[PDB]
Amino acid sequence: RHMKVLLLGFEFLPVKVGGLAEALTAISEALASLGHEVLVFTPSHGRFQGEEIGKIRVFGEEVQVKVSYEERGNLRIYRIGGGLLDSEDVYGPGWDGLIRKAVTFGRASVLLLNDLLREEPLPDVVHFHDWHTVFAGALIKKYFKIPAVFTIHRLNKSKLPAFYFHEAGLSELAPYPDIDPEHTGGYIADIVTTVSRGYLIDEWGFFRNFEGKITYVFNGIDCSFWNESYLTGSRDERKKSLLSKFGMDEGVTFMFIGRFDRGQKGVDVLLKAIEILSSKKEFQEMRFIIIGKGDPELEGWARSLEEKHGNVKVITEMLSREFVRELYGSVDFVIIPSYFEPFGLVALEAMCLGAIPIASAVGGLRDIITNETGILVKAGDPGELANAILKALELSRSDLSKFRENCKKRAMSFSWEKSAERYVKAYA
Ligand SMILES: OC[C@H]1O[C@H](O[C@H]2[C@H](O)[C@@H](O)[C@@H](O[C@H]3[C@H](O)[C@@H](O)[C@@H](O[C@H]4[C@H](O)[C@@H](O)[C@@H](O)O[C@@H]4CO)O[C@@H]3CO)O[C@@H]2CO)[C@H](O)[C@@H](O)[C@@H]1O
Ligand SMILES: [Cl-]
Ligand SMILES: [Cl-]
Ligand SMILES: [Cl-]
Numbered sequence: 396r397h398m399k400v401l402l403l404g405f406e407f408l409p410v411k412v413g414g415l416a417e418a419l420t421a422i423s424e425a426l427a428s429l430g431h432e433v434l435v436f437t438p439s440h441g442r443f444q445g446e447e448i449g450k451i452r453v454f455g456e457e458v459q460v461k462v463s464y465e466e467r468g469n470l471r472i473y474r475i476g477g478g479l480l481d482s483e484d485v486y487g488p489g490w491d492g493l494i495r496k497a498v499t500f501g502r503a504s505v506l507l508l509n510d511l512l513r514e515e516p517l518p519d520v521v522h523f524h525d526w527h528t529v530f531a532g533a534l535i536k537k538y539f540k541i542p543a544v545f546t547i548h549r550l551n552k553s554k555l556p557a558f559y560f561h562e563a564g565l566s567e568l569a570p571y572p573d574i575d576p577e578h579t580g581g582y583i584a585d586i587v588t589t590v591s592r593g594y595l596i597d598e599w600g601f602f603r604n605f606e607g608k609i610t611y612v613f614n615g616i617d618c619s620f621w622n623e624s625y626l627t628g629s630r631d632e633r634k635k636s637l638l639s640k641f642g643m644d645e646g647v648t649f650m651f652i653g654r655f656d657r658g659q660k661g662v663d664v665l666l667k668a669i670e671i672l673s674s675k676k677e678f679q680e681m682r683f684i685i686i687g688k689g690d691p692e693l694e695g696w697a698r699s700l701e702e703k704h705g706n707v708k709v710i711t712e713m714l715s716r717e718f719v720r721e722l723y724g725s726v727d728f729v730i731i732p733s734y735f736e737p738f739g740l741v742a743l744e745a746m747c748l749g750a751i752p753i754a755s756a757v758g759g760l761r762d763i764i765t766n767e768t769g770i771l772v773k774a775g776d777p778g779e780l781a782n783a784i785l786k787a788l789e790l791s792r793s794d795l796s797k798f799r800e801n802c803k804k805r806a807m808s809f810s811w812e813k814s815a816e817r818y819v820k821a822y823a
């Protein structure tokens with residue numbers, strides 16, 4: 396039953412870059428609330444000012460380690476500062492700084508766990524996340540000999556010089572001049588996981604190295620935040636109103652929310668799909684809201700289409716999640732033309748709010764979006780996307796309502812509690 400878990404993560408609310416902080420906080424809270432004792436080690440990144448607990452030696456120098464302790468029942472959070480762990484640049488500063496920071500975090504973690512073990516038993520498992528925490532995971536397994544579980548949220552696919560493993564005290568893990576840290580993490584782990592069954596398959600070229608000890612464990616979504624109980628009026632009124640607030644009268648509405656970049660989130664695919672459609676007769680019963688920022692080229696292309704058409708709105712400012720929740724709760728479709736997707740949180744947030752997804756058939760999107768709950772399409776293919784948008788527009792029959800309902804039912808089976816229960820089996 397009850398386990399004591401040591402969870403190593405490189406970000407953790409309130410200190411976040413993208414969604415990882417929130418996902419790790421969610422997991423920890425879920426584990427805790429099932430009754431398990433959960434200790435979290437994570438860097439301070441400059442936000443906390445902890446107690447000195449002793450020195451470590453990193454790259455020929457001494458570093459005084461600091462620790463801030465937050466405790467809430469079975470959930471125990473240790474934020475470790477000292478040297479590079481004080482940089483506010485979570486994934487820095489610079490590439491070299493980052494990796495030195497990750498080594499620093501590895502030695503600092505060992506120090507802390509020794510310090511703690513003076514007064515409590517060893518944890519039953521160490522669960523570390525992403526490549527940044529591999530020095531720490533590998534050192535803890537090595538020194539304290541406890542079962543390790545390695546979870547990959549996103550494969551960085553990059554190598555480090557052996558120098559770093561040597562300096563970390565992990566020479567035995569460095570039999571070549573250059574070493575893939577993700578591969579090392581899978582290698583020393585008793586169990587490896589990633590956050591979706593379709594990403595595990597999309598990356599089987601990597602993950603097959605761990606046949607026999609590899610599985611997937613989905614992430615969750617917070618549907619207590621993402622639901623419609625926060626919105627008023629009916630969906631028609633809201634849409635009628637939003638569109639109008641954008642200069643447009645009613646029409647079936649598609650939304651994209653994403654950074655603007657090449658070969659990732661796929662706004663370029665969508666901007667092209669739109670051009671492809673901007674000559675059909677039905678392009679006129681369609682409204683597009685494009686939200687994000689990044690590549691200037693991609694920005695201009697979007698601003699230009701906005702100008703060319705009184706049918707396209709573009710938002711490069713930053714939207715609060717309260718407001719995004721409003722958008723999802725009022726548009727007809729959300730479009731998710733990713734080139735790859737470890738999990739698919741946006742699809743879930745949208746689905747929790749009755750928006751019907753049209754997504755690339757990549758990674759977790761293939762898991763999440765089943766055939767009664769959204770439309771899937773080849774990634775990278777503007778004509779396939781433009782076509783799907785067309786199908787959707789013809790879909791417009793008040794049995795979009797069947798879809799919407801299926802979307803909600805579905806998205807909500809992705810609870811964090813189920814993730815946690817799943818990780819617990821894996822721990823055991
Ligand atoms: O099981 C032992 C190790 O397993 C894992 O190692 C991985 C590496 O992380 C991968 O990067 C790769 O190793 C490559 C290596 O990256 C590359 O430099 C090259 O190595 C040559 C080397 O240049 C040359 O000097 C000579 O000694 O031969 C080497 C091998 O021919 O190619 C390597 C071979 O793939 O693959 C291994 C496979 O495991 C894990 O990362 C380690 O921590 C673990 O100890
Ligand atoms: Cl992200
Ligand atoms: Cl040390
Ligand atoms: Cl195979």
Ligand SMILES: [K+]
Nearest residue numbers: 455456457458
């Ligand atoms: K010194």
Ligand SMILES: [K+]
Nearest residue numbers: 592595610611
């Ligand atoms: K299976």
Ligand SMILES: [K+]
Nearest residue numbers: 737738739740
């Ligand atoms: K994701």
